[PDB]
Structure formats: C-alpha cells, structure tokens
Amino acid sequence: WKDCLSIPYRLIFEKFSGKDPNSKDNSVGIQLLGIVMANDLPPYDPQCGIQSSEYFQALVNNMSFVRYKEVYAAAAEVLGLILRYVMERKNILEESLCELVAKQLKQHQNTMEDKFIVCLNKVTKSFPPLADRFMNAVFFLLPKFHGVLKTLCLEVVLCRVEGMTELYFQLKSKDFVQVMRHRDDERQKVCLDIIYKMMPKLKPVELRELLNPVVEFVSHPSTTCREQMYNILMWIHDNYRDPESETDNDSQEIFKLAKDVLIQGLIDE
C-alpha cells in the first residue's frame, strides 16, 4: 500500500505498558512495535502523546517477565532493531541511549544469566554493537552451558566478532580441540560458521592445527554442515595454492592436503 501513515505512539504504548505482565499478552505491543520495524522501518521516533527515554525504559523492562518462554526474550529483539534503526536513522539520543542499553544489560546479566545471554544474542544478532564491553564475561559461560546455549553463546561471539583475546590464547585448547568434535548439527554448523570468518587472522601454525579437525567433516551426514567444510577448504585452497616459493611450508602443504581433500569432495553423496 501507498505512503506510510505513521502511527500515534499512544496506540503502541499501552500494548507493551498497560499491565506489567504476569501473562503472555504484553508481547502484543512488542509484536506491534516490531511491525513499524518490519516494513522497511517507517518513522517511529516518538513525539505525540509520550516521551522517548521513559518509553524505552518501560520497553526494556519487558525482558524482566521471566516466568514465560516467549515473553521476556521478545523485548530484546524489538530493542536490538531499535539499535539498527537509531544507528542508521542516526538519531541524536544514541550516546546516552547506548549507555542506558549497557546499563540495562549490566544490571541483569549479573542476575539472570541465561536470559540475558539470550538478550545479548537478540542484541548482537539483530544488530551487532553492544557486546564489546562484555566479551570476557561471554567466553566465561561458553564452557558452563552445553546445547542451545552453546550455540547462542557462540552466536554472540560470532555476531560481534572483533578478534577479542588474541583468540588462540583463550581458545587453542578451550573449545576447538573437542567442542568442534561435538555432535549436534546446529552446534557443528555455527562452529564451522566461526571457522569460515577467522581466516585472515590465522597464522599457518594454527591453520595446520585447526584444518585437521575440520577435515573430520568428511564423515558428516549433513550436506548443510559439510558445505561449510567445503567453503572453508575452498578458501584454504585459493589462498594457499602455491606462489613461487615459501618460507612457511604449511602455506603450501596444508594446500598439499586441501588439494587432495577437495578431490575427496568430487565423488560425494
């Protein structure tokens, strides 16, 4: 349909703010505010009937209602796209706003650890920024939680990757020796999805140490996982196909492996 018809913030308000919930219902204003994100994000930018930072403070309180699995987490989606929106609409609040978001995560990942790692994944995944202040305290929990929270803790590190902690001196044992060797297809998927972007910052030493446990995916029933093992191997190949001569012998002998295990791709299931 034509134009945009920007909605009065009065409507939007009550639907996330009427009753501080003991209930599912208040995720209605959360859905709604998500729709003035959804349609290429028309003007939100509150003026009429209500004032900005309080409107957001009430909005961040929605992730406090931890009795119900769909209620609390949803707020951090809507709020993560506020950052995408206020970042790229560039609105002038953004400094003290970002300190309020940092303050909100810092009050409550301190006391609600899963629910606020999930929150730092709705932030970070839905728009990247906030985790920079925290990152030590995220790597912190990746060995404490298995399963879905393995994948979401990984997915925070992933979505906000900036090479934190010179990574192998955090990680050279701590995950990639054996969490890489650990079963669940989605865990393995996000895991190779980490591998596939760490490329430019690997030295040939760890590239040798890490390619070999990736070569293991030659066994794997998921073409969806195995493709990324190939995206990887293709990157290895193209970057370590032999120039004129090398000091770093692995920078053609990881290739002397890759240039074979690509052949071991050519037959596949």
UniProtKB/Swiss-Prot annotation:
Which sequence positions carry the modification called N6-acetyllysine? Answer: 15
Q: Which disease is it linked to?
A: Immunodeficiency 26 with or without neurologic abnormalities: A form of severe combined immunodeficiency characterized by reduced or absent T and B cells, recurrent candidiasis, and lower respiratory tract infections. Some patients show dysmorphic features, severe growth failure, microcephaly, seizures, and impaired neurological functions.
Annotated protein name in UniProt: DNA-dependent protein kinase catalytic subunit
Localization per record: Nucleus; Nucleus, Nucleolus; Cytoplasm, Cytosol
Please report the PTM annotation for this entry: Autophosphorylated at two clusters, the T2609 cluster and the S2056 cluster. Autophosphorylation induces a conformational change that leads to remodeling of the DNA-PK complex, requisite for efficient end processing and DNA repair.
Q: What does this protein do?
A: Serine/threonine-protein kinase that acts as a molecular sensor for DNA damage. Involved in DNA non-homologous end joining (NHEJ) required for double-strand break (DSB) repair and V(D)J recombination. Must be bound to DNA to express its catalytic properties. Promotes processing of hairpin DNA structures in V(D)J recombination by activation of the hairpin endonuclease artemis (DCLRE1C). Recruited by XRCC5 and XRCC6 to DNA ends and is required to (1) protect and align broken ends of DNA, thereby preventing their degradation, (2) and sequester the DSB for repair by NHEJ.
Give the domain of life: Eukaryota
Q: Which family does it belong to?
A: Belongs to the PI3/PI4-kinase family.
- Indicate the quaternary assembly: DNA-PK is a heterotrimer of PRKDC and the Ku dimer (composed of XRCC6/Ku70 and XRCC5/Ku86). Formation of this complex may be promoted by interaction with ILF3. Component of the core long-range non-homologous end joining (NHEJ) complex (also named DNA-PK complex) composed of PRKDC, LIG4, XRCC4, XRCC6/Ku70, XRCC5/Ku86 and NHEJ1/XLF. Additional component of the NHEJ complex includes PAXX. Following autophosphorylation, PRKDC dissociates from DNA. Interacts with DNA-PKcs-interacting protein (KIP) with the region upstream the kinase domain.
